[PDB]
Amino acid sequence: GFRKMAFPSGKVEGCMVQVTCGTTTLNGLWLDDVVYCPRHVICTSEDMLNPNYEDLLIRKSNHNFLVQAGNVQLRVIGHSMQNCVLKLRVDTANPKTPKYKFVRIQPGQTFSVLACYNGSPSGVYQCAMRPNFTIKGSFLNGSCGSVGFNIDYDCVSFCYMHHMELPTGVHAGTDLEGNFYGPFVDRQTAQAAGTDTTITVNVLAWLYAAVINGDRWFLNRFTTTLNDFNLVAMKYNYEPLTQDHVDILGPLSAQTGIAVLDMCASLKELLQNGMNGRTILGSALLEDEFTPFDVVRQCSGVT
Amino acid sequence: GFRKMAFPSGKVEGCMVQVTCGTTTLNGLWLDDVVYCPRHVICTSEDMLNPNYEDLLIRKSNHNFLVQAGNVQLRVIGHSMQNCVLKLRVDTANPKTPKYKFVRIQPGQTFSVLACYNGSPSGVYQCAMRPNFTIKGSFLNGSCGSVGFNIDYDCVSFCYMHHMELPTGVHAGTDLEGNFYGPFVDRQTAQAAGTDTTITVNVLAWLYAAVINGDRWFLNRFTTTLNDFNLVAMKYNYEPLTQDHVDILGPLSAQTGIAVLDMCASLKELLQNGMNGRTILGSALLEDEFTPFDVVRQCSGVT
Ligand SMILES: CC(C)(C)c1ccc(N(C(=O)c2c[nH]cn2)[C@@H](C(=O)NC2CCCCC2)c2cccnc2)cc1
Ligand SMILES: CC(C)(C)c1ccc(N(C(=O)c2c[nH]cn2)[C@@H](C(=O)NC2CCCCC2)c2cccnc2)cc1
């Protein structure tokens, strides 16, 4: 039953446009009279290895940028570069612009992705920012410019714009001010992502979700200290658990009656012994892309 | 990377309303000047065990039905029952009504669910109709009236309206003409779902998705006949594979160069030997809630 659940996507759907520069097409985000999109739309195959974006942008004129909203052609009024995003001024403000803000999220946090091709939404799914600042998304060629977001009542918080795939199949992108998450650059070069680690506070949230849903077998009698837990966690490539994380798990602990450090003792045994062919929430691996908030809202129905 | 992916939900979001009858609140679908919702909204705790819906509806008047769209109160003009759904005539046609049709889907088919509480969308996820006509959804109390749908370009095909949870945690609902999928009834009584079986054509689609994504280890040298495959499949509670299913897998077979019956031979060995602790697409179990269409569109970017 318990599953990855995205935010309703309607407010973002009304913002997605197609941006074509030369032979290249990708997606842009139309808020008020500005369309945001990856600046690598202005590259050519002749310049992808080490483009000089300042020079490339100089050579462009407004009319080199074809922007379409549905089947409607928006005239670009001006163009500028903010870090790795291009801001295309258009002569019409998007009448479907929602209330929004730009936010830069933290590793371990989750968001919904509205995957788009040729400016048209194709699917919505929940994703997480990995500790190494990649996202393990589902993106095909031409998905660049698709955005990740969270919704707070009426307000859309945009946190990710998709830029590229790393040759290992994971994905890299920026905040909506164009700063990459992680060490990545928007050129065709060999790029290593760091070692990825497991998001411990999220695995704990998911164990609480298991308990909430009656899956309880992994619970044991014991407790542990944060330090003692963290010693084992390091050896299994788990992120350190902080007192902040303990405090963030407070609501789930209160709902189930299981102290955070008691859940930590259960996770410690699971790491040392594996699942012996049993499953938790219909899964044979420990899931780390549900936040405590994610669990709370799917198990409490936040709208 | 490969994951469950829902349709963009915007067109359905504009249709969700709150319906309150007495002390009970659930969701309704506002299309043109009609709001559709589960007829069990008219029950009371005193009548839930064996309600007489004809009599209960007789006793209701238009003003017993409180319908709200956002914070706007729609006046019910008339009320009628079509099988297990109530059709509330309201004096305003929904200006956000999309192009739509009502469809009754087949076991094994998938759809997106827009989960709603108090008439407000809370999340979107992909679901499948189980062979025993349950759906393994993520629904809390008050989610009744939430709908499942597919999108064909501009047209929303509604196929499911959520009615109730069965005490085993799976869910039961109707098409949008109010006919339950499966043997279930909308009263508080002991209700068995039949034995559930694995959707073989979907497991095959998901193995093709694995191959498309470079996960190839389970491939073997052999082929098999449909009959020979089906003999083994029965013993593992797999649905029979038909020639229609073979034909439906044609596109995926053509893309990967693996004949359908060769994939069937690989699945036959996986069933008899298990995965030996290996995973396919990051999963230690065989996934059966992706259709061949689902795979094609996520691996080809249908908008
Ligand atoms: C110019 C630059 C920065 C090198 C670049 C080039 C191509 C793209 N990719 C576009 O699909 C695409 C479409 N329109 C423009 N680019 C894809 C992409 O990353 N390929 C490769 C680029 C470097 C080598 C490895 C990956 C892509 C595929 C799947 C999901 N997401 C994006 C992204 C950035
Ligand atoms: C009257 C009738 C048909 C017996 C009924 C009663 C309650 C509801 N449930 C409402 O939550 C709800 C909210 N408003 C009105 N009903 C829930 C539901 O099925 N409980 C039980 C009903 C019979 C015994 C087992 C389950 C529900 C929970 C989680 C997800 N989905 C629905 C559905 C149908």
UniProtKB/Swiss-Prot annotation, chains A, B:
Subcellular location: Host cytoplasm; Host Golgi apparatus; Host nucleus
Domain called Peptidase C30: residue spans: 1-303
Ranges in a coiled coil: none
Regulation: Inhibited by pyridone-containing alpha-ketoamides compounds 13a and 13b. In turn, alpha-ketoamide 13b (tert-butyl (1-((S)-1-(((S)-4-(benzylamino)-3,4-dioxo-1-((S)-2-oxopyrrolidin-3-yl)butan-2-yl)amino)-3-cyclopropyl-1-oxopropan-2-yl)-2-oxo-1,2-dihydropyridin-3-yl)carbamate) inhibits SARS-CoV-2 replication in human lung cells. Inhibited ex vivo by michael acceptor inhibitor N3. Inhibited ex vivo by compound 11a and 11b.
Positions of the catalytic residues: 40, 144
Cross-link (Glycyl lysine isopeptide (Lys-Gly) (interchain with G-Cter in ubiquitin)): 4, 89
Protein name per UniProt: 3C-like proteinase nsp5
Source species: Severe acute respiratory syndrome coronavirus 2 (2019-nCoV)
